[PDB]
Design a protein around this ligand. Structure first.
Ligand code: CU
Ligand code: CU
Ligand code: CU
Ligand code: CU
Ligand code: CU
Ligand code: CU
Lengths: 335, 335, 335
């Protein structure tokens, strides 16, 4: 169909780690699904010792919100760059075809907005990110990325075509940060975004992140902000990394079905311990919880997780199952 | 079945690179398979110039021994932490479900042991590793990991369901080491394990290994300690990397059938030149030798292999096959 | 068949990024396909500020030329090392079986040549590279690698066995460079290849490239040297990385069908945003262009691409398609 003649619907986005309400399988025909995002440059505290990042975001969060459509829908995004920001921005959708993913059609200076439509003709999770000419990696590593999820119209399927369903989706964006230090060995704090640029590029070129965080900060997805589930619930874990490889893992769980390259027309793999999200992509894993307790969800380069920040928690309620795991003898003196 | 009512068998572990005797396909029903491992902290010489590592091991080796069961069996491990060690330890099994892979149920201080049971309900090679709260990557990178192999009850299969069989299994654990240097440019030698901690964490956070070794040392799997095979023999090469990505390769061979994500319910890929083991996982490759000679088996980041240590040898006996490869003209002056 | 009795054909190689003319599906039976390559050591300017590399090449280019045969053919390569070079060289073919991929049979000192035959019995793209004993990574990272493509005799196929065809093939070799700096912070320029060795090994061991280039230089595949296509044309993008992982991506496009591990007997994946070439391998992607414009083809570690060099351009002619993408509202003041 011709999109100019199709029904339009508007979606209200929600902040990560939640994902806006949506259908999996749907009886709906194709639609033009309208979204708006407003860019916010802001200084953020990214660790427990007061380190700040001169950050750049879609909609005020790292990652930006996840946008969900169905295959054959059109995405119609209005991108707003308020006059309170300093930099130009745009958006590149890996789910889109042409014009550098839309970036060439969405260059907005502070004070401007633009509206892009594209056909979401390929199913999968896809990164979107800012990509202004001449300063692409800086905008990405400063926070400007998120996920577009294009569901098959009949929902997710296993390799034999059997339906897969989730009860809850969570979106995790993983951010390799390049925060400069000064000659005193302390992280720098900058009064403006522009002042951070040159020093940050030098750190970037070392390819060594200072921090690697989920969802904007060390510990973002812990404590009151842990992810939650129950025994018996199936969760979809969407993982985006717009710049650098990562290897997600659920400690004490598995990826029951995983699309690590993130593209739902391909059969998923089962029983994964650790999967691989290529830098510049989003992938997705399903898991049905079978044990209660506090899980970790992390990048299984354990230095990247525990030393640099790429780890969160999932608090799961329900009944312990001694068939799956039992302590036969508790720690006690060696006989 | 209820594991409390199933038959128990005990397995005697063997040191890497061998793997304890086991069946592939079996007529046996599910069993509770009992293993014991004893933690040994020890100083190890890890290269040819006398560099030492304040190491931590399961059963005295890097990697720990490979444990082999069949899908539907239960693993029942007694983990012993003698009083001669300095640190607490535990074990996390990626093949297990719940309680942080078992780590929460196996915290043993020096002088203690504990016994864990879990259902091995998913086929594949899976990493196990130590994970004590607050010092997880240090224990892993100091040597505390190995593989659990859960074979399908009817043995390995190709993508069409045809049986695959191996004559010999070898287990290779690859270890990214973070050995500190002092201000004189020499690697540090520490009198105790605890004294090594702070300096090692700083090196870890650079994400640059000093050494990357197979099986505990540069050259571990070379010379008298080369792996061996014959023309016509099919070998299974199990490769674990509990912390960091690697890319195994057999020079002059291939991965005939490879499960790079390591999970046997998924179809393997064929004819691989180089495969990919995500940090935090174990994978497996089958190869049937067709030529004699000394092969290298290595990580094909060739700097990681030849400069940092991640390479071994396979000495293969038998008859050379000029159909597969022939020197037509030996090196000689250019006409 | 016995290769000694088969027909021989000679192929004239062409420089990257082109690939010599070849059939996809063929009615031909197996042949011994003869190639010659001549090693050239030379100083190359690799960036826009005059940095030089003491380089090493097959046939004068980075990468070496792509060699194309069909499964069941034999490759018969004459490798020539002129007396004007300083170092010994050889060749290792990942597509070959035995004798360290051929390296043991092709050790040529300056002034020598050798001829190797092997059976190309496995379909796929495969790296070939130099591997002289004791200095393997140096020769690889200095430029000595390329691709052997072994096509199935009936051409490429999708997961259901349907024929896939390309109109044009391009070959991209990605090179992680390790150029030393002196104490003044400037890149070193060396009068000879041998003088560069020790300093380069120290940089290599940091695992941090100074530059990461396609096809020999920052910007090699841009401007007059951009890749070209038209709307409606299907291109095969061959990507080799003999030493280090990379993650190819076509901005504004996709991998329609991708063999990221590069082995054509395995089913390809569809709709990829970003794929993964393991260090030590070659992979291949098909894409049919649907929009005109200047695309980027890059490594989607965006620092590696935009800061270090791993990016090129594809200039595509034809008609813009507003169904796939349309600017609904151009950048304008915020209402
Ligand atoms: Cu931006
Ligand atoms: Cu992108
Ligand atoms: Cu431990
Ligand atoms: Cu783990
Ligand atoms: Cu060479
Ligand atoms: Cu190689």
């Amino acid at each position: 169909q011709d999109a100019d003649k199709l029904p339009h619907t508007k979606v209200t986005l929600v902040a990560p780690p939640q994902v806006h309400p949506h259908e999996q399988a749907t009886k709906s025909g194709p639609k033009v699904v309208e979204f708006t995002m407003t860019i916010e440059e802001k200084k953020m505290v990214i660790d427990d010792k007061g380190t700040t990042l001169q950050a750049m975001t879609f909609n005020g969060s790292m990652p930006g919100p996840t946008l969900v459509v169905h295959e054959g829908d059109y995405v119609q995004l209005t991108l707003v760059n308020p006059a309170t920001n300093a930099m130009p921005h745009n958006v590149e959708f890996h789910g889109a075809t042409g014009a550098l993913g839309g970036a060439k059609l969405t260059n907005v200076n502070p004070g401007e907005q633009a509206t892009l439509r594209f056909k979401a003709d390929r199913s999968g999770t896809f990164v979107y990110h800012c990509a202004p000419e001449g300063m692409v990696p800086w905008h990405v590593v400063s926070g400007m990325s998120g996920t577009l999820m294009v569901l098959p119209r009949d929902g997710l399927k296993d390799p034999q075509g059997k339906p897969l369903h989730y009860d809850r989706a969570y979106t995790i964006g993983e951010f390799d940060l390049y925060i400069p230090k000064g000659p005193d060995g302390k992280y720098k704090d900058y009064a403006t975004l522009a002042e951070s640029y040159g020093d940050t590029v030098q750190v970037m070129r070392t390819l060594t992140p200072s921090h690697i965080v989920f969802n904007g900060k060390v510990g973002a997805l812990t404590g009151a902000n842990a992810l939650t589930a129950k025994v018996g619930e199936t969760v979809l874990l969407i993982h985006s990394q717009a710049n650098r490889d990562t290897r997600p893992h659920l400690i004490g769980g598995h990826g029951d079905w995983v699309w690590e390259t993130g593209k739902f027309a391909n059969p998923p793999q089962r029983d994964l311990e650790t999967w691989f999200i290529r830098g510049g992509s989003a992938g997705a894993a399903l898991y049905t919880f079978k044990q209660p307790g506090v899980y970790a969800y992390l990048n299984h380069n354990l230095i990247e997780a525990f030393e640099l920040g790429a780890a969160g928690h999932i608090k799961v309620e329900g009944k312990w199952n001694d068939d799956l795991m039992k302590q036969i003898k508790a720690p006690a003196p060696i006989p």
